[PDB]
C-alpha cells in the first residue's frame, strides 16, 4: 500500500522482464490468461445479456 523507490523500480523491472521473456516464448501464462478471460464468466455474461435483451424485447 506504500510506494518507495525500491518498490517502483522493482515493479517496472518486473513488467519489462515479463514482457521480454514472453517475446522469447520462455513463459507459460495459461492460468493468468484464463483467469482474466474466464470462459465460464464469458458464458455467464453472455446468458445475462441474452436475458436482458429478451426482457427489453418483450416489454413492448
Amino acid at each position: 500500500n506504500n510506494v518507495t523507490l525500491k518498490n517502483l523500480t522493482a515493479f517496472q523491472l518486473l513488467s519489462q522482464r515479463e514482457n521480454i521473456c514472453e517475446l522469447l516464448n520462455l513463459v507459460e501464462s495459461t492460468e493468468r490468461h484464463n483467469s482474466i478471460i474466464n470462459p465460464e464468466r464469458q458464458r455467464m455474461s453472455l446468458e445475462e445479456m441474452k436475458k436482458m435483451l429478451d426482457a427489453l424485447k418483450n416489454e413492448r
Binding site: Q42, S45, L46, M49, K50, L53, L56
Partner: protein, 93 residues
Amino acid sequence: KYIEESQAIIQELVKLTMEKLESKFTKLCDLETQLEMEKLKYVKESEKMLNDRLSLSKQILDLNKSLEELNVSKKLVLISEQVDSGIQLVEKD
C-alpha cells in the same frame, strides 16, 4: 464467432437501453413542467391569502377598538384558530 455474437447482442442491448432511458427522461421533463405550473399558481394564491390575513387581522383590531369606543358589548372573534377559517361578531359580558 463467440465474441462476434456477443458484439451483436451488445449493440442491440445498448440501443434499446438508450431509447428506453430517453423516453423516461422525456416523461420526467413533462411532469416537471406541470409541477412548476402548479407551484406557481399555489404561490400566487398563498401570497394573496397571507396579505389578506394580515390586513384583516389589523382591521379586526381597529374595529374592536372602535366598538369599545362607542359602548357596544360585542366583539369580533375568529370562528377557529385562524382568520381564513372565518370571523364573526359575538356578544360577551
